[PDB]
Amino acid sequence: VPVSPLQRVNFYSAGYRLDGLLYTPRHLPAGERRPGVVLLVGYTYLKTMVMPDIAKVLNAAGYVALVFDYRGFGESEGPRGRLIPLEQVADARAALTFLAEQSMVDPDRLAVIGISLGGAHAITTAALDQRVRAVVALEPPGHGARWLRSLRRHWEWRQFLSRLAEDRRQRVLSGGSTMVDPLEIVLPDPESQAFLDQVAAEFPQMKVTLPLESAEALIEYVSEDLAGRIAPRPLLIIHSDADQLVPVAEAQAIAERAGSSAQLEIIPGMSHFNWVMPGSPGFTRVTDSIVKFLRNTLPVS
Numbered sequence: 085v086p087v088s089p090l091q092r093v094n095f096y097s098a099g100y101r102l103d104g105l106l107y108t109p110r111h112l113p114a115g116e117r118r119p120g121v122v123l124l125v126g127y128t129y130l131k132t133m134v135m136p137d138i139a140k141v142l143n144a145a146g147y148v149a150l151v152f153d154y155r156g157f158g159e160s161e162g163p164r165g166r167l168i169p170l171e172q173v174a175d176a177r178a179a180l181t182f183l184a185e186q187s188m189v190d191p192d193r194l195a196v197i198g199i200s201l202g203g204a205h206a207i208t209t210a211a212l213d214q215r216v217r218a219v220v221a222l223e224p225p226g227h228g229a230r231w232l233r234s235l236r237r238h239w240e241w242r243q244f245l246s247r248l249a250e251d252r253r254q255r256v257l258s259g260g261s262t263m264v265d266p267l268e269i270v271l272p273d274p275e276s277q278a279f280l281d282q283v284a285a286e287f288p289q290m291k292v293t294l295p296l297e298s299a300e301a302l303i304e305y306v307s308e309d310l311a312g313r314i315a316p317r318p319l320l321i322i323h324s325d326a327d328q329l330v331p332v333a334e335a336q337a338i339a340e341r342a343g344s345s346a347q348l349e350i351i352p353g354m355s356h357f358n359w360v361m362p363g364s365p366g367f368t369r370v371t372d373s374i375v376k377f378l379r380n381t382l383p384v385s
Contacts, residue, residue: 085187086114087108087188088108089107089108089109089110089143090105090106090107090108091105091106091108092104092105093105093150093152093182095152095178095179095181095182096178097155097171097174097178097179098155098171098174098178100155100160100161100162101160101161102152102153102154102155102161102175102178102179103131103152103153103158103160104131104150104151104152104153104179104182105131105136105139105150105151105152106148106149106150106186107136107139107140107142107143107148107149107150108143108148108188109143109144109146109147109148110143112188116188117187117188117189117190118146118147118148118188118189118190118193118384119146119147119148119189119190119193119194119378119384120147120148120149120150120183120184120186120189120190120191120193120194120195121147121148121149121150121194121195121196121197121378122149122150122151122176122180122183122194122195122196122197122209123135123138123139123149123150123151123197123198123202124172124176124196124197124198124199124202124203124205124206125151125153125154125198125199125202126198126199126200126201126202126203127167127200127201127270128165128167128266128290128292128294129199129202129290130153130157130158130287130289130290131151131152131153131159132158132287133283133287133290134199134360135149135151135199136151137360137362137367138197138371138374139151140362141371141374141375142374142375142378145375145378145379145384146384147378147384148183148186148188148189150179150182150183152175152179154167154172154175155171155172155175157292158289164292164293165263165266165292165293165294165295166294166295166297166298167294167298167301167302168297168298168301169201169204169205169208169228169301169302169305170208170301170305172202172205173205173208173209173212176196176205176206176209177209177212177213180194180196180209180213180216184215191215192217193217193382194215194216194217195216195217195218195219195220195378195381195382196209196210196216196218196219196220197219197220197222197374198220198222198224199223200222200223200224200225200329200330200356201224201225201302203220203221203222203223203224203321204221204226204305204307205307206219206220206221206224207219207221207224207307207310207311207314207319207338207342208307208310210314210317210319211307211311211312211313211314212310212313216317217317217381217382218317218318218319218320218377218381218382219314219318219319219320220319220320220322220374220377220378221319221320221321221322221335221338222321222322222323222370223322223323223324223327223329223330223334223335223356224307224321224323224330224334224335224338225305225307225330226306226307226308226311226334226335226337226338226341227306227307227308227334227337228302228303228304228305228306229303229306230334230337231330231331231334232244232269232271232299232302232303234331234333235270235271235272235329236271240271247296248296248299248300248303251295251296251297251300252297252300255295255297261295261296261297262295262296263293263294263295264293264294264295264296265293266292266293266294267280269294269296269298269299269302270329272329273329275328275355276328276329276356276357279357283357307338308337308338308341309341311338311341311342311346312341312342312343314342314345315345316345317345318345318346318347318377318381319342319345319346319347320346320347320349320373320374320377321335321338321339321342321346321347321348321349322349322351322370322373322374323335323348323349323350323351324350324351324352324353324354324355325350325352326352326353326354326355326358327354327355327356328355328356329356330356332350335348336348347377349373351366351369351370353365353366353369354366354369354370
């Protein structure tokens with residue numbers, strides 16, 4: 085049975101039916117198993133954003149790629165907009181189980197690539213799961229509280245923390261968390277706000293609200309504390325100084341904790357959003373860096 089180059093797939097995570105897209109290289113010989121890559125999207129992003137373009141590059145280099153929506157997001161089941169980082173990591177581990185069961189994939193040659201918050205998930209997933217042979221983390225927050233803290237002036241952060249303590253009281257006493265615009269938690273600079281408005285105008289189905297509980301779980305989410313556990317398995321961290329939404333200091337703090345087997349690559353012309361377009365020079369420089377890392381870590385041969 086020849087495998088279709090593009091399949092809509094479904095698999096479960098904690099009883100929730102997750103929705104994914106499985107990219108297999110065109111005209112792949114029958115019986116041939118290839119390295120499989122799990123693609124992890126960022127904060128409130130849908131699986132159709134950026135990842136189908138990265139999967140196309142990956143398929144041309146001979147790799148099988150799987151992207152999926154986290155529980156509560158996109159086409160996946162789950163409490164709507166309820167973002168709990170360790171649940172997104174558990175979803176990524178269920179995606180590894182599904183991908184390892186595919187006929188065209190070698191279960192012993194699995195890799196994970198994540199963008200931004202998904203990059204922190206790639207690190208956490210590799211730390212807890214030995215099936216991850218290689219990891220790529222693009223623009224990852226190393227410490228949730230430090231990352232979100234840096235987006236506000238100190239007085240604004242203290243005020244946000246008090247709002248969170250009041251919400252913790254209300255959800256324990258009565259059951260529900262206050263639902264907010266995701267940009268009330270990840271407070272963007274005016275530049276990111278303008279791009280995010282453009283991306284939301286194009287993908288209006290990406291519109292969601294998150295419970296304030298998601299800010300508290302993100303504050304307690306420190307992928308830095310687990311980065312060292314990736315032991316001799318390689319990690320590539322791709323970041324830049326130009327990133328105003330996730331400071332490059334986050335990538336630097338992860339690289340110090342991960343050690344010598346990790347490699348930190350700074351790309352000069354690279355903001356949080358200027359490299360996403362497939363025709364852009366930043367897209368080519370990023371995807372070339374990913375493909376080179378995957379080639380000498382998980383060779384197609």
